[PDB]
Amino acid sequence: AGFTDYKVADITLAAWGRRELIIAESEMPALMGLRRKYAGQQPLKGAKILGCIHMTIQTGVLIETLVALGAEVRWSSCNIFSTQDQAAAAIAAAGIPVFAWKGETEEEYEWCIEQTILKDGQPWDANMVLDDGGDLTEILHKKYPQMLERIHGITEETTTGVHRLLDMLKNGTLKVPAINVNDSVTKSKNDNKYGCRHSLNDAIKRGTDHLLSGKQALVIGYGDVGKGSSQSLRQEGMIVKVAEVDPICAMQACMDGFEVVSPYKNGINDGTEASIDAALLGKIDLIVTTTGNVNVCDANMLKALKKRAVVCNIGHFDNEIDTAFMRKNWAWEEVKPQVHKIHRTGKDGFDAHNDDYLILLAEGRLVNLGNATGHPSRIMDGSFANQVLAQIHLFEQKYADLPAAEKAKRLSVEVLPKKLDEEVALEMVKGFGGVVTQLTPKQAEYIGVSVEGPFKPDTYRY
Amino acid sequence: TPAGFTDYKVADITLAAWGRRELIIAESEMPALMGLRRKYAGQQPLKGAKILGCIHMTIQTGVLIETLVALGAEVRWSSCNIFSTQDQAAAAIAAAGIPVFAWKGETEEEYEWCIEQTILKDGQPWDANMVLDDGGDLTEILHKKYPQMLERIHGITEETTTGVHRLLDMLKNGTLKVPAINVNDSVTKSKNDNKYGCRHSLNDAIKRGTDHLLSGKQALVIGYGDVGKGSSQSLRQEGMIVKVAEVDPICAMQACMDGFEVVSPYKNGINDGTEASIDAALLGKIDLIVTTTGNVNVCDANMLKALKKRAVVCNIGHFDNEIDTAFMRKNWAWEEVKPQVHKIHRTGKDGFDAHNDDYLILLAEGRLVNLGNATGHPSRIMDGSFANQVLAQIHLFEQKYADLPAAEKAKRLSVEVLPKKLDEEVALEMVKGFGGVVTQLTPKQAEYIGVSVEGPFKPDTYRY
Amino acid sequence: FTDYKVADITLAAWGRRELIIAESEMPALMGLRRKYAGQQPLKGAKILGCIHMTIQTGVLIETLVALGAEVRWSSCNIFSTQDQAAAAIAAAGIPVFAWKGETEEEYEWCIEQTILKDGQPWDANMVLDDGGDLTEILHKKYPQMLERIHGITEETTTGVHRLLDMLKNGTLKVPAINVNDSVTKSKNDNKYGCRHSLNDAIKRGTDHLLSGKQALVIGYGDVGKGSSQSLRQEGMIVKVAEVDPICAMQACMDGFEVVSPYKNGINDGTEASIDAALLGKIDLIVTTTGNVNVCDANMLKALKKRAVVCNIGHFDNEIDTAFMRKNWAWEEVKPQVHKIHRTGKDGFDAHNDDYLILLAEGRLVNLGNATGHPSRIMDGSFANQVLAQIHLFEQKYADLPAAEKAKRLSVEVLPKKLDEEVALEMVKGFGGVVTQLTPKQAEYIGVSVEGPFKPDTYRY
Amino acid sequence: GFTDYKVADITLAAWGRRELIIAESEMPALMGLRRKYAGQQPLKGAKILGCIHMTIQTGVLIETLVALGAEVRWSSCNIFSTQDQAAAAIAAAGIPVFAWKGETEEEYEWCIEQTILKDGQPWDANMVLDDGGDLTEILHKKYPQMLERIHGITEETTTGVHRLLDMLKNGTLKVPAINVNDSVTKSKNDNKYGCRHSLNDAIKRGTDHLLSGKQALVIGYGDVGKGSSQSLRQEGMIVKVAEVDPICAMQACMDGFEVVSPYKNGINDGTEASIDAALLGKIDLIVTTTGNVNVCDANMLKALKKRAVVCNIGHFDNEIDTAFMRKNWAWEEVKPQVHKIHRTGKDGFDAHNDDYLILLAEGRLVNLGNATGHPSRIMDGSFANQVLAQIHLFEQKYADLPAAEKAKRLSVEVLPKKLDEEVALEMVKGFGGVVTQLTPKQAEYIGVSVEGPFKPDTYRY
Numbered sequence A: 001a002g003f004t005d006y007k008v009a010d011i012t013l014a015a016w017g018r019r020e021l022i023i024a025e026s027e028m029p030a031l032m033g034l035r036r037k038y039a040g041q042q043p044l045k046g047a048k049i050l051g052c053i054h055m056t057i058q059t060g061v062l063i064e065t066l067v068a069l070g071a072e073v074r075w076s077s078c079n080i081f082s083t084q085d086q087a088a089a090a091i092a093a094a095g096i097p098v099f100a101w102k103g104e105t106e107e108e109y110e111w112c113i114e115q116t117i118l119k120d121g122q123p124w125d126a127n128m129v130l131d132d133g134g135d136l137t138e139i140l141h142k143k144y145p146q147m148l149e150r151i152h153g154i155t156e157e158t159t160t161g162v163h164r165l166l167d168m169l170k171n172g173t174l175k176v177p178a179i180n181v182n183d184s185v186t187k188s189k190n191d192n193k194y195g196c197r198h199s200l201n202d203a204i205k206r207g208t209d210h211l212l213s214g215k216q217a218l219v220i221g222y223g224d225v226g227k228g229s230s231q232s233l234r235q236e237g238m239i240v241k242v243a244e245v246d247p248i249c250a251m252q253a254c255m256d257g258f259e260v261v262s263p264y265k266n267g268i269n270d271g272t273e274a275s276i277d278a279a280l281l282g283k284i285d286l287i288v289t290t291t292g293n294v295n296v297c298d299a300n301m302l303k304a305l306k307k308r309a310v311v312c313n314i315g316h317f318d319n320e321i322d323t324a325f326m327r328k329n330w331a332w333e334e335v336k337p338q339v340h341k342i343h344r345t346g347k348d349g350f351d352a353h354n355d356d357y358l359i360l361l362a363e364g365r366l367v368n369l370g371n372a373t374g375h376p377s378r379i380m381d382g383s384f385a386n387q388v389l390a391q392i393h394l395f396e397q398k399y400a401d402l403p404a405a406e407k408a409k410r411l412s413v414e415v416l417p418k419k420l421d422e423e424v425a426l427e428m429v430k431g432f433g434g435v436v437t438q439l440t441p442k443q444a445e446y447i448g449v450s451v452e453g454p455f456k457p458d459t460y461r462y
Numbered sequence B: 001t002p003a004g005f006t007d008y009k010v011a012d013i014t015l016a017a018w019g020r021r022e023l024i025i026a027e028s029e030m031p032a033l034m035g036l037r038r039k040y041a042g043q044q045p046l047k048g049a050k051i052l053g054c055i056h057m058t059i060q061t062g063v064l065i066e067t068l069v070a071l072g073a074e075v076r077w078s079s080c081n082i083f084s085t086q087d088q089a090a091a092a093i094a095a096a097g098i099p100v101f102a103w104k105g106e107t108e109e110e111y112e113w114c115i116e117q118t119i120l121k122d123g124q125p126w127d128a129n130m131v132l133d134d135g136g137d138l139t140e141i142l143h144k145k146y147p148q149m150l151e152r153i154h155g156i157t158e159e160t161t162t163g164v165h166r167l168l169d170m171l172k173n174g175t176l177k178v179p180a181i182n183v184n185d186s187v188t189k190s191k192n193d194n195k196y197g198c199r200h201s202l203n204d205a206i207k208r209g210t211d212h213l214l215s216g217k218q219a220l221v222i223g224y225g226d227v228g229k230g231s232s233q234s235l236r237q238e239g240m241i242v243k244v245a246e247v248d249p250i251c252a253m254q255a256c257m258d259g260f261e262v263v264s265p266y267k268n269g270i271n272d273g274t275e276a277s278i279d280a281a282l283l284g285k286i287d288l289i290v291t292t293t294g295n296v297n298v299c300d301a302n303m304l305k306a307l308k309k310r311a312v313v314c315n316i317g318h319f320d321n322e323i324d325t326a327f328m329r330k331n332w333a334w335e336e337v338k339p340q341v342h343k344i345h346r347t348g349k350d351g352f353d354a355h356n357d358d359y360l361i362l363l364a365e366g367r368l369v370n371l372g373n374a375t376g377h378p379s380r381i382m383d384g385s386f387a388n389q390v391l392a393q394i395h396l397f398e399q400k401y402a403d404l405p406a407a408e409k410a411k412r413l414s415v416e417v418l419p420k421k422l423d424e425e426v427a428l429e430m431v432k433g434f435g436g437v438v439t440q441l442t443p444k445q446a447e448y449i450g451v452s453v454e455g456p457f458k459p460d461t462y463r464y
Numbered sequence C: 001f002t003d004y005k006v007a008d009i010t011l012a013a014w015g016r017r018e019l020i021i022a023e024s025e026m027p028a029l030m031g032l033r034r035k036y037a038g039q040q041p042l043k044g045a046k047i048l049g050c051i052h053m054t055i056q057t058g059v060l061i062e063t064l065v066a067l068g069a070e071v072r073w074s075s076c077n078i079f080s081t082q083d084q085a086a087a088a089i090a091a092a093g094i095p096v097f098a099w100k101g102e103t104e105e106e107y108e109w110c111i112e113q114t115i116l117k118d119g120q121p122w123d124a125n126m127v128l129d130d131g132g133d134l135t136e137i138l139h140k141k142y143p144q145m146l147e148r149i150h151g152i153t154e155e156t157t158t159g160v161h162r163l164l165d166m167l168k169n170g171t172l173k174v175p176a177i178n179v180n181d182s183v184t185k186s187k188n189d190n191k192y193g194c195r196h197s198l199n200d201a202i203k204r205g206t207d208h209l210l211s212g213k214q215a216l217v218i219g220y221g222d223v224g225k226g227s228s229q230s231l232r233q234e235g236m237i238v239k240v241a242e243v244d245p246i247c248a249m250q251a252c253m254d255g256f257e258v259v260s261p262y263k264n265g266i267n268d269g270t271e272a273s274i275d276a277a278l279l280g281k282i283d284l285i286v287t288t289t290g291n292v293n294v295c296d297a298n299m300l301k302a303l304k305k306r307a308v309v310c311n312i313g314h315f316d317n318e319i320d321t322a323f324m325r326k327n328w329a330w331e332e333v334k335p336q337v338h339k340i341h342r343t344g345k346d347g348f349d350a351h352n353d354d355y356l357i358l359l360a361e362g363r364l365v366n367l368g369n370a371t372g373h374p375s376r377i378m379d380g381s382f383a384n385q386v387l388a389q390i391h392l393f394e395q396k397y398a399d400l401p402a403a404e405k406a407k408r409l410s411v412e413v414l415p416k417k418l419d420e421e422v423a424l425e426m427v428k429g430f431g432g433v434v435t436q437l438t439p440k441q442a443e444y445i446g447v448s449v450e451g452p453f454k455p456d457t458y459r460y
Numbered sequence D: 001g002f003t004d005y006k007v008a009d010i011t012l013a014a015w016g017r018r019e020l021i022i023a024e025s026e027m028p029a030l031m032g033l034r035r036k037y038a039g040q041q042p043l044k045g046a047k048i049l050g051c052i053h054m055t056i057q058t059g060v061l062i063e064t065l066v067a068l069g070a071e072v073r074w075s076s077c078n079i080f081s082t083q084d085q086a087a088a089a090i091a092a093a094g095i096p097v098f099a100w101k102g103e104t105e106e107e108y109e110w111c112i113e114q115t116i117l118k119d120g121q122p123w124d125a126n127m128v129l130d131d132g133g134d135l136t137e138i139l140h141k142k143y144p145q146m147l148e149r150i151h152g153i154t155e156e157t158t159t160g161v162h163r164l165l166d167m168l169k170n171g172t173l174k175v176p177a178i179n180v181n182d183s184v185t186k187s188k189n190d191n192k193y194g195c196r197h198s199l200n201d202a203i204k205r206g207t208d209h210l211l212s213g214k215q216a217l218v219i220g221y222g223d224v225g226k227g228s229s230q231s232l233r234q235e236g237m238i239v240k241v242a243e244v245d246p247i248c249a250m251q252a253c254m255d256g257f258e259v260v261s262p263y264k265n266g267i268n269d270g271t272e273a274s275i276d277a278a279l280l281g282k283i284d285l286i287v288t289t290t291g292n293v294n295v296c297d298a299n300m301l302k303a304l305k306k307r308a309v310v311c312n313i314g315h316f317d318n319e320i321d322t323a324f325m326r327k328n329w330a331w332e333e334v335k336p337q338v339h340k341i342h343r344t345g346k347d348g349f350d351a352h353n354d355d356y357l358i359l360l361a362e363g364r365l366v367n368l369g370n371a372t373g374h375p376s377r378i379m380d381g382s383f384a385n386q387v388l389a390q391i392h393l394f395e396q397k398y399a400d401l402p403a404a405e406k407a408k409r410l411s412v413e414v415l416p417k418k419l420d421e422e423v424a425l426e427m428v429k430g431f432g433g434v435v436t437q438l439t440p441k442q443a444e445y446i447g448v449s450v451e452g453p454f455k456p457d458t459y460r461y
């Protein structure tokens, strides 16, 4: 009532968004357990959180948990295609500043992040950051250093964002401490892997409605996202080949039942067309990049792909695929939003019945969020319970108020303790109806642990 | 065979030719190990090493033994389990003039005698200076009964989770006398051997022991670590309906996401020692229970009383105390079907009716079932484990801890893992063995993610 | 051109883009276009068609037209139309009456608009049907039109069941081809199509994680087999119910636990017969039977809170949705997704936790909440349809003397040789390479080198 | 003083008996028939010549026939498939059996002849149980006067049925037969899931090879090829499938397999030039499943990747051209039923040669040659059908019919669906499965009786 501090696609989608939020709450027991456990204590009272992460229904439940624990927030999406417009509407209709819609331009994307940083044309009195991929973190460091003086910490969601934080820490340019939320086991080995198992084939079906069984796929990378992606396709009956630069991850792909190949003859990427294994790429119906690296589906690979192959990226940024080359050289025919046929016949127009085209999903942006709805609530429950715990921890540490000498001892990128990781996992397991066994005192003593945990040394890899 | 060689004890020396044929096949299945043989043979990095070895005397261990010897070592060998020796592998090693004391079906007394035969040569302590162990039994005997021998030993290379646990306990209590390498926690060990090894060999052992159809039946896997993960997959891929029990909620979370129902043998998960705490309805529908924990009494007497008639019971953890077989020896009548396959008749202790329907089938008397009823992990998986063992032996032997002054010794008394660069090099040879082709990063790409083109490719915190 | 009714004609260009993609996914259908274009074997055929107005059906429609036919089309379900497909067909000048979200009355009206042209019966001479609704209406309300119709080609198990019942009772007026029972239909479409599209529909409707949750699939025929795999491959813990012990044996061997909603399998009508403990652990129930009331009122009362309920058999009476309309309050989440509040009939608490989620109001969930089977699977079914249309149209049943009609009034399947030819085109579409028998090998197993390769008894 | 048998070692009898008692608890359909029909003795007076793999599972079948009143004389239908402890247990029970693991071809024929003849003259046989048609063929060729008094043949397997239908078509079949193979509780149980269980079993026992990550080529995708492909894919193999039947090939594609041919463009012109050498040079394991001849031929064998495993799970060993390998290459026995075939020539071999293939069971049925064949709970279905088929044909008494009636009943037929469903129900109950009973309204709705049959005869499952 008099609330205008937002920008969304269509505020009238709010009722729909709220209905899906209420369903999502029943799917996110770890997050709702934190809401119930901490609402009375208000651990985030006084926290003012700049948040930049995909404005989905799942993020909505995270935002309202932070608010329920006392926080104020100003929110944007971390991708131009990942917002669910009904989720953004519901958050805006609840009186929460949010600047996010599906299908932003790059200019609008930056404008949305700035609308969270600035309130009434001046820096918001922010003191906490929640980021997914590091874009908000980067803009604060380059453009708003005086704001970082008063920020107690950053809680970063994803592998690519953690890499950018560690880069800054090594260079001595990180200004506030951070929690690497990504490397909780209930994040990395849940969200990154099983989330992509759920949502990769989901997005490919919604975009193309292609049968996947019996066709050939090439997954580039076999980390947590590549593992999940490869399973998303293999469980549908695809014949999946895996590329990797890490021989340990390649070994896992072999033992998991995949053939390990390289787009390049003998794996040597020398920049020439002659290095492309044209015979291999000429049989591939679907290529998925999962690396967080640059140009792993390059222009020569795109030229060699089988006609009518699907091309998509599920890593954080779109530069995994050389989409710039395709914009320069080939004609783009939009099938529907976030589905384009790329005609390799040339740049100036195309025959509507041309058979030499590729299908690109979400213009090379994160395909699970761009062409579907990303990971499901019950998986994001784990990631976002860690986010809430990470926000509570850094806000209580009050880094910004410490003397310079004490700041120097606390400026780091850390993970949550294993005990908290286990407590998140336990709520997830109970959500499935699973029953964890309790060690007897004898058994606890025998393996050298407390009955309540933690159950594994910090070196353990699961 | 060296003239007059008698410094060994095996079941049947006439099996040596068969063993040698299978060793030649296994060399072709173990490219990381044979690649170390080719790379290091000329340089002889283990010349002067005298290795006491205690690990399952299989064909795969045979290839490991002859690699150590090819690099210059002398060895004296025993198995780390009474049922895990393949007698044709022991025979081939003995016929090569290598002291080995190992046969399938040892008694517990013979098991200790075999280890002592490695430790003693001609009635006196051998001048050993290295130890390779799997489970910590050889390490324990040296520390407890031959402590002076450890004054000359440069290090221990320990194969398995349970053995490392024991070493870390000694380190924490100040009782470990020599440095050790935790071979288990190489990724090309723990996340290869422990998981995929059990995936290959668990259903293999159950089939050899019982020839039971597995599809459509109910299994309960106790544990979901690396061995529990592989064991659950071994059974699920055969079409079993697999339930998983865990005390670790993170491992239980993985089990749920992997498609398993997570249950406890006890109502509400609370194990209070009473029959009343047993979920009798659950245990009464289980056809197969497998323990994978490395913990004690995780398949207890009341569980055994409540199990479905004719359920199979087995253990793939390192030691047999995962199952309360002592209870079964005390109370129930054992009928041997064939070696390492026993019907345990719950009707009472003395006799049994030949056609009684109320029995359980116990495999390998509760000892490691994959080695006891089949042949353990396959050569191509053991390749990674044993490449790491060889690298760990070279590293500790070269450090010469026993030759250091006491000040320098205190700095190096530790339990370490091999560096990630070596882990990656093992994996690369494994991938090539499959015909896999690893892509090489461009310089720009290596710069982009902050690694060298040659690796390592992951920070040490990475969990794979 | 105004002889159509679709939701939004401006969707035509989008639909045409997707038809052009679909053509590249349907090599068996497109091969028929190339093979028979010169003969025009359907020249003079006027086909009443009643089947889900999807992109895939669009390619079928345009294949029939390319071979000479005229058609007038409706959907066979109120929720299965893809509006852009309907628009693309309408924009090409083809009469079609179909949109997503019809009422039952509009559904009936649409079929009647195919039957009637300018207020009078169209001079139809062929029928293509999926489920038997158009066949039933013609027999009961327009029996005179069947005097000019040469045959029916029926798509699906439930439609074939209805044809055989009419044949047994002597009420079927024209011959028919059972398209369902070609192997490239029944063992492709019914099984693998549901494998692809069941989890697809559940994800689009609810975006629920499926891994780790408990499913109960009622039935294990072809649709039940594909449905169970759709869920198991996502990591659901799937239990299977069956009345047929052979199908139940297949479920056991395929790795599923076989259970009944009723204690000891005995459905005596009482709440006491419900296995409440089992139903109280089920997160998702899917009915696949073609039977009536296999998810009944007492089962719905006993289901775990917030379980998903859906049906992928042809008709919605597999679930007792009528009970739920009478007794419980429905909250629309979005089209084809309703929360059903077991707290009462009049109103509901917006935060109530005691509800079920029903998809597509109990109608075919794969078509109602997603897009049904993928083009490359429907290629097989619809190539059989085209061949079956050609065969019955060439037989010219309606022109035969009454004495010769009696000898041809039957329900038949296509011959195996054609089944194999459709399959080969599908295999080639994957890049598969079939081996050719040597003369000696062909003699050894007693087949011709070109096939057929199996006796008619073979079950694959 | 029972001496009417020949087995490897009678002292294995106690061990065989122990495994028989276990197997009875895994075979509820078959033991259900034992309990249901024991008092009635429906096979009293039956005298059955039996020729099928002398396994523990066959032991339970034999003792079921005996318990129902039959006498029998038994042999194995393959030289490597006998389990010596099962043969010993049967002989120790006083049942004539002539079978051991590792027969020569000459001994194989002698064993069958020992069942046909008793004390040097034709036994008074009146029933035949066969697996593959070898006993059936010898009777028709060499003992026609015995067939005059025989009421029928019950034939287990696809290849045996093919030989029966050829005889029927040529007018040479002398007695009616039941095609046991094509019961759904046989063909879609035994042929498929039995090979799923036992193919990777036999490969592990023979070689202990890791299968995960390696390349397999399965020739054929019928029931045996389907189950074999699953046996390897579930272990993590990368499985390619070859087929001549496009419908079976379509199934392989949709099941998630790549469909390939050993020959370029699928055309076998008999020369090396037609072999896809790039494909075969990548294959770690080839398995033949066809029932056809020379589907893994000499030119394929020459092109296979070094150290590939070659095996056959169809009924006869001519699926692989082992004759070519015997004529040209040197064989090194690793252990029984496992040979290295050195492609360096025929005159000796280097013990460390790298260019060899591994042949399992000398090309004979690999699941039975290198392991124990199908598990008891699967053979339960097959052998319940066998017992019922024996009962049906013995009760018909074809040999006593007048010539005019014989002509009307000389056929090869399958058991009715009601029997197939009742076998399946006992298998399901063995897993603890609970089948739902239709209500009268539901049975009416789909047009079936509450007790079944639930499907028309056309249904393919």
Ligand SMILES: NC(=O)c1ccc[n+]([C@@H]2O[C@H](COP(=O)([O-])OP(=O)(O)OC[C@H]3O[C@@H](n4cnc5c(N)ncnc54)[C@H](O)[C@@H]3O)[C@@H](O)[C@H]2O)c1
Pocket: A158, A159, A160, A161, A191, A192, A195, A196, A220, A221, A222, A223, A224, A225, A226, A243, A244, A245, A246, A249, A290, A291, A292, A293, A296, A314, A315, A316, A317, A366, A367, A368, A369, A374, A375, B439, B441, B445, B457
């Ligand atoms: N879309 C989603 O929902 C989602 C979820 C989590 C993470 N992510 C993003 O996905 C990316 C990967 O995340 P992760 O956790 O899997 O990282 P990771 O480090 O676990 O895996 C990346 C893998 O790519 C491999 N790789 C690098 N360059 C390669 C090349 N040229 N060819 C082949 N393989 C190559 C690396 O060896 C590594 O194993 C990141 O950008 C992350 O932020 C996306």
Ligand SMILES: NC(=O)c1ccc[n+]([C@@H]2O[C@H](COP(=O)([O-])OP(=O)(O)OC[C@H]3O[C@@H](n4cnc5c(N)ncnc54)[C@H](O)[C@@H]3O)[C@@H](O)[C@H]2O)c1
Pocket: A437, A439, A443, A455, B160, B161, B162, B163, B193, B194, B197, B198, B222, B223, B224, B225, B226, B227, B228, B245, B246, B247, B248, B251, B292, B293, B294, B295, B298, B316, B317, B318, B319, B368, B369, B370, B371, B376, B377
């Ligand atoms: N047989 C083989 O070939 C083989 C191979 C490798 C290791 N091992 C042995 O197997 C054992 C397990 O090794 P690992 O690497 O999997 O160790 P691990 O630590 O990875 O896993 C053991 C798991 O057991 C769980 N657990 C403990 N007590 C439990 C209880 N009471 N109920 C349920 N779950 C319980 C723990 O939470 C843990 O996740 C060790 O003894 C190891 O030495 C055997």
Ligand SMILES: NC(=O)c1ccc[n+]([C@@H]2O[C@H](COP(=O)([O-])OP(=O)(O)OC[C@H]3O[C@@H](n4cnc5c(N)ncnc54)[C@H](O)[C@@H]3O)[C@@H](O)[C@H]2O)c1
Pocket: C156, C157, C158, C159, C189, C190, C193, C194, C218, C219, C220, C221, C222, C223, C224, C241, C242, C243, C244, C247, C288, C289, C290, C291, C294, C312, C313, C314, C315, C364, C365, C366, C367, C372, C373, D436, D438, D442, D454
């Ligand atoms: N949605 C789709 O895309 C699609 C595709 C093909 C067919 N269908 C429809 O799906 C239905 C099933 O087709 P089908 O080809 O699988 O038929 P089917 O005869 O192969 O299978 C139906 C199965 O249900 C079982 N069944 C019957 N009543 C039961 C009960 N009370 N409890 C448990 N099981 C019971 C039967 O035993 C049978 O095995 C039909 O209505 C058919 O028209 C839908």
Ligand SMILES: NC(=O)c1ccc[n+]([C@@H]2O[C@H](COP(=O)([O-])OP(=O)(O)OC[C@H]3O[C@@H](n4cnc5c(N)ncnc54)[C@H](O)[C@@H]3O)[C@@H](O)[C@H]2O)c1
Pocket: C435, C437, C441, C453, D157, D158, D159, D160, D190, D191, D194, D195, D219, D220, D221, D222, D223, D224, D225, D242, D243, D244, D245, D248, D289, D290, D291, D292, D295, D313, D314, D315, D316, D365, D366, D367, D368, D373, D374
């Ligand atoms: N080992 C066992 O336990 C066991 C069990 C059952 C049957 N069998 C035997 O296995 C064989 C197969 O039986 P089935 O029931 O699977 O028969 P089937 O007719 O169902 O399948 C055989 C398949 O081989 C294919 N084929 C034929 N020639 C081919 C070629 N040159 N290349 C590729 N594919 C080719 C056919 O198209 C067919 O689909 C028979 O000999 C049968 O008696 C063995």
Ligand SMILES: Nc1ncnc2[nH]cnc12
Pocket: A053, A054, A055, A056, A057, A058, A059, A195, A369, A373, A374, A375, A376, A380
């Ligand atoms: N649904 C989702 N919401 C927010 N962040 C995500 N990352 C992946 N899936 C997501």
Ligand SMILES: Nc1ncnc2[nH]cnc12
Pocket: C051, C052, C054, C056, C057, C193, C367, C371, C372, C373, C374, C378
């Ligand atoms: N996509 C589709 N089109 C037409 N009929 C169908 N039946 C199932 N899926 C279908």
Ligand SMILES: [K+]
Pocket: A056, A058, A373, A374, A375, A376, A377, C207
């Ligand atoms: K979602």
Ligand SMILES: [K+]
Pocket: B058, B060, B375, B376, B377, B378, B379, D208
């Ligand atoms: K082994």
Ligand SMILES: [K+]
Pocket: A209, C054, C056, C371, C372, C373, C374, C375
């Ligand atoms: K579709």
Ligand SMILES: [K+]
Pocket: B211, D055, D057, D372, D373, D374, D375, D376
């Ligand atoms: K067996």
